[PDB]
Paper text:
Recent reports have shown [name] phosphatases bind tightly to the CNNM family of membrane proteins to regulate magnesium efflux. We report four new crystal structures of [name] proteins bound to the [name] CBS-pair domain that reveal the effects of cysteine disulphide formation and nucleotide binding on complex formation.
We also crystallized the [name]•[name] complex in the presence of a mixture of AMP and ATP. Electron density was observed at the CBS-pair domain dimer interface but it was intermediate in size and could not be fit satisfactorily by either AMP or ATP. Accordingly, the density was modeled as ADP. While it is possible that ADP was formed by hydrolysis of ATP during crystallization (see below), more likely, the crystals contain a mixture of AMP- and ATP-bound protein. The nucleotide ribose hydrogen bonded with Thr319 and Asp439 while the phosphates associated with Thr347 and Thr436. His346 mediated π-stacking interactions with the adenine moiety. A putative metal ion was identified on the dimer axis coordinated by Glu438 and the nucleotide phosphates. This site of nucleotide binding is conserved in other CBS-pair domains including the domain from CNNM29, 10. Other than minor rearrangements, nucleotide binding did not significantly change the conformation of the CBS-pair domain or its interaction with [name]. Superposition of the free and ADP-bound CBS-pair domains showed a shift of 0.6 Å over 144 atoms.
Numbering used by the authors:
A (entry chain C), C (entry chain C): 297 to 446
B (entry chain A), D (entry chain A): -1 to 155
Write the structure that this text describes.
């Protein structure tokens, strides 16, 4: 039990990597760049219970900007304002972490820095072609916590 | 450390200077050139096909060069000869200028050309890769590493 | 430093109480029950970066319902729909924790239960009058975490 | 444990049964009576002033009794005599019915009357408080605890 289980949790932060803890792409709430912000998609956003939402064109693995909740502030549903207008009102920074990365580093950087959200890359060796970074999904601060508290 | 950005990369060596870059659209074309002016590039080499108009970039006075070659291949021998000859003339024109290379994957064949330049400027093949991969992780595939090993300086910069 | 500091954190969960960790009322984002949901207050909600927002009448210490982000789903700004209509579309449960309560209990209950949010009471002895529970503010899961990770 | 709700409380003892309750508005008057029917109360004693109409509650057949007394005081001797006489007649009418008492603070003078009932039904003053405070923490002030100590059964239930 318990606090003893948690202490092993913090001890295993140096062992465990982002790979272990992430939300993989297929379970991420994200929007297409070309999406319009009508009543329903706005409802869908506010249902999703997420404050930072990734934005892609047109394959899901191609993350391009972030939408924040605060970005939605004075938008009228069926203005029908398209998404990429609002993403173009702001530089929100998008942060990328490697899938290698040990959790204790990740936790300290989250302790430091701007966003609670990074998105996750591995390198890609097989293929004839050029090496590319391959998008795996999201990791947040709350992800790293859940290692400790379970 | 350990977190990063969709963002240009710089390699410096003697008074050679290089930029590896993302692709733009036309959508952020005017912002993209302003990055490049900020690093003081005179020269862009597109080594992978892109769709944007180059002529906004060329209007703001950067020499733009369309030298595409096959995905994940070594550069053909023309392209290396061209590329070396370009570097001579353009560091002749202004010492301590930058030359941009860009692809649509910044790992792969864009940094090959930079590693080709570094090898024919000094540093060991073993050493040359290391400086690249420190800056952009996992940088070449095995065919490119083969070619970069089997490569011989004259030493013609 | 570091993980060693965190391990003391989990060890002190049995010591430390909600009193130590809470957000006191004066720093809580909350709405009056009689508030209308026009463009600006809706903007103010979506700026606040909170998903669960307490609702009071008409002194701030008198919490009555919870507003969720999901509750806002198909509301039109200047319908001008008043707040207490939307709070009356839903039973959202509101949970109360005592200010006495040790953090390790709180953490386990958050690990269990429905909301990530409790609101905080102490008993009240001084006074001539009846004893009452006095509202101090909010505690969340993220509050309890911050003890460990700092 | 350790987290709770804006919610009624029950105390049982022999075939006496008691409910301590929140205040409603008219706004949730019709829901409030449905709670009370669910516990099977025949009788409400308002011991603190409220503004709602009682007649929706009385229409659904609960005897409603307006017996207000001073904030944080002991009940005056009339009220105790009334209250005891009420309990006789209403547990005479139906054994294993419930009697609701409610204030606008559920700690204080509402549970005093319940503790008065429990003392004149058996259990020790020390014991009687404990059963209350287990159910609603921190339940009486010191004046009430004084009165509850200095109180003597006949023992007239
Ligand atoms: N846009 C998103 N799409 C899908 N899952 C997400 C998104 N944002 C966060 N998550 C996931 O939700 C969990 C908790 O996230 P949290 O840090 O509370 O941020 P949020 O407030 O956006 O939920 C994590 O497991 C994380 O991977
Ligand atoms: N409605 C609110 N008003 C003020 N502060 C809040 C509110 N909700 C949460 N907080 C505070 O924000 C911090 C983190 O809350 P968190 O668990 O992330 O929920 P939220 O997603 O609502 O921020 C905590 O310190 C908590 O006390």
């Amino acid at each position: 039990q318990g606090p003893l289980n948690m202490i092993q949790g913090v001890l295993e932060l140096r062992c465990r990597t982002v790979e272990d803890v992430l939300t993989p792409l297929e379970d991420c709430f994200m929007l297409d760049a070309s999406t319009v912000l009508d009543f329903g998609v706005l409802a869908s956003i506010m249902q999703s219970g997420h404050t930072r939402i990734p934005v892609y064109e047109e394959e899901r693995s191609n993350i391009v900007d972030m939408l924040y909740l605060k970005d939605l502030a004075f938008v009228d549903p069926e203005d029908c304002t398209p998404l990429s207008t609002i993403t173009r009102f702001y530089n929100h920074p998008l942060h990328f972490v490697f899938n290698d990365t040990k959790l204790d580093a990740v936790l300290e950087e989250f302790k430091r820095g701007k966003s609670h959200l990074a998105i996750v890359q591995k390198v890609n060796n097989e293929g004839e072609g050029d090496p590319f970074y391959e998008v795996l999904g999201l990791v947040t601060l709350e992800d790293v916590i859940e290692e400790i508290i379970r | 450390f350990a977190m990063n950005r969709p963002a240009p990369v710089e390699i410096s060596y003697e008074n050679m200077r290089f930029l590896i870059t993302h692709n733009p659209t036309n959508a952020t074309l005017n912002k993209f050139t302003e990055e490049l002016k900020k690093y003081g590039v005179t020269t862009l080499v597109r080594v992978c096909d892109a769709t944007y108009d180059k002529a906004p970039v060329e209007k703001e006075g950067i020499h733009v060069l369309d030298w595409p070659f096959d995905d994940g291949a070594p550069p053909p021998n023309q392209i290396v000869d061209d590329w070396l000859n370009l570097l001579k003339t353009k560091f002749r024109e202004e010492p301590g200028c930058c030359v941009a290379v860009h692809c649509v994957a910044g790992l792969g064949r864009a940094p090959v050309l930079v590693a080709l330049a570094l090898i024919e400027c000094g540093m060991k093949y073993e050493d040359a890769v290391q400086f690249i991969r420190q800056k952009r992780r996992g940088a070449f595939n095995s065919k490119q590493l083969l070619y970069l090993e089997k490569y011989r300086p004259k030493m013609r910069l």
